Amino acid sequence: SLFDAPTLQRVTVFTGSALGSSSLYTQAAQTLAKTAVDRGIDLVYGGGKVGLMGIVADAFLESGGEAFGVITESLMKGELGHEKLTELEIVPDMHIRKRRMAELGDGFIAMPGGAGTLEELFEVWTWQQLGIHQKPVALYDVDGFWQPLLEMLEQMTQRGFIKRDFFECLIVESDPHALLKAMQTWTPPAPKWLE
Amino acid sequence: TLQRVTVFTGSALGSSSLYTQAAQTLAKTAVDRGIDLVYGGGKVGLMGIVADAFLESGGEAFGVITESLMKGELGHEKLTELEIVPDMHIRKRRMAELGDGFIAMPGGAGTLEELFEVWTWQQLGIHQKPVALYDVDGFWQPLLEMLEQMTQRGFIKRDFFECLIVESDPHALLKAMQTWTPP
């Protein structure tokens, strides 16, 4: 229906190819995967087998959900792709990879990661602002990991480079049930009233 | 050597005229070095400011813009050359091909997005070009603080974070770019 948000069938997850320095990030990813599958949401992600990327894909498969990785030729030649995925799309470059992860997902989540995770997050958020998609964008704030980013965006907003209304449409939860609940009920803000 | 530099900067002007001025001063400094501008082709915000400044100072400015943004009345019509491309990704492929290095002046989410793409791709060996942050009025300090924590939590190689250029003065910035070596 026209008044309804599309219902989330898949979520695209951005996260590190390292595990990072707390056991907690491995736990927290596992929990989200379980919650996701509980609501019949499947996973789209970058197709890796190590670090949090690997953790989250494995947790998804193990809870009995599905998992669609999208990976490049370069990465597949260097034999870095996960081998037991529901599907694994191999594409010529990093652009197409991001484009395809964004077409496949019904929403985006950023779990802890580094530069690459930021590359992906800001792109999809920018695109939301340009009207290229109207899918929700969320930060999984595991042990406050994303708090420094929020301080940075708050400062950018104050200096006038980001509209407060966009920044406030960013979902940030540390609880996974909350996170996905906000993603399901999310609607984009009316262009009619931005300020 | 550095002949063209790709600049990422905000589509708005920001709440203080300091940014406009720094953007102007940087363009002059780069023209004096013989360096031309490559950027996303807009006339609004600091994009417009920096492109005007390169032109008015005797230098050249090349824009790469999508068909959509052109249609949106955001394009600059008095550049040295303006390429029109299908989409955002071809636009970044081209800005990266044309650039010999990358500078991120103040901006928002659009700027962040371009910045992180080319930084990440430096980490992966896709290119070996300097990436620099023009730290006007400490604008990028909160970003460095975020990166510092990510490095302390295991998600960014310290080695790589240290190869990131950060400078508030434009003569220092361009010299840092000119003498930089890869990680």
Residue numbers in the entry:
A (entry chain B): 3 to 197
B (entry chain A): 9 to 191
What did the published study say regarding this structure?
LOG produces active cytokinins via dephosphoribosylation, directly hydrolyzing the bond between N6-substituted bases and ribose 5′-monophosphates in cytokinin precursors such as iPRMP or trans-zeatin riboside 5′-monophosphate (tZRMP). Interestingly, C. glutamicum ATCC 13032 contains a gene product of Cg2612 that is annotated as a possible LDC (pfam03641) and a nucleotide-binding protein. Based on biochemical studies and structural comparison with other LOGs, we propose that Cg2612 functions as an LOG. On the other hand, EcCadA showed no phosphoribohydrolase activity with AMP as a substrate. These results confirm that Cg2612 belongs to the LOG family, and hereafter, we will represent Cg2612 as CgLOG.
To investigate the function of Cg2612, we determined its crystal structure at a 2.3 Å resolution. The asymmetric unit contained four molecules and seems to contain two distinct dimers. Interestingly, among four monomers in the asymmetric unit, two monomers contain a phosphate ion at each active site. We then performed small-angle X-ray scattering (SAXS) experiment to further confirm the dimeric conformation of Cg2612 in solution, and the result indicates that Cg2612 functions as a dimer as observed in other LOGs. The monomeric structure of Cg2612 shows an α/β fold belonging to a Rossmann fold. The central β-sheet which is formed by seven parallel β-strands is surrounded by eight α-helices. The dimerization interface is mainly composed of α5- and α6-helices, and the α4-helix partially aids in dimerization. Dimerization of two polypeptides constitutes a pocket which serves as the active site, and the conserved “PGGXGTXXE” motif was found in the surface of the pocket, which will be described in detail later. In our current structure, one phosphate and one glycerol molecule are bound at the AMP binding site and these molecules mimic the stabilization of the phosphate moiety and the ribose ring, respectively. Two proposed catalytic residues, Arg99 and Glu122, are located in the vicinity of the bond to be hydrolyzed; a covalent bond between adenine-N9 and ribose-C1.
